[PDB]
Amino acid sequence: NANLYKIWLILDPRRVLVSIVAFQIVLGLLIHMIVLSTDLNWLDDNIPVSYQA
């Protein structure tokens, strides 16, 4: 809609930005945790070579 800019007359910009930043950082950490525990792991998969040997 063209009159969507009035959303900032209801929501306080400062809290919106702080919540966005915190939620994005937490989501990044959580998704990295989730991906690390599958077969898509990039650290402990001996590519290119194995270094503990």
């Binding site: 800019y5 009035k6 959303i7 900032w8 007359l9 306080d12 910009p13 898509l40």
Partner: protein, 40 residues
């Protein structure tokens, strides 16, 4: 919130352009991650 109307317009413009830049960077990163390790 106490904001006027012109301030709301300016904040909306800057917020939209920043969100679009962030989404573009995320899309590029996901393109690289798909070119490296396809998951689907």
């Amino acid at each position: 919130t106490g904001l006027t109307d012109d301030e709301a317009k300016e904040f909306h413009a800057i917020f939209m352009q920043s969100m679009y830049a962030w989404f573009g960077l995320v899309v590029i990163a996901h393109l690289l991650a798909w070119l490296y390790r396809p998951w689907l």
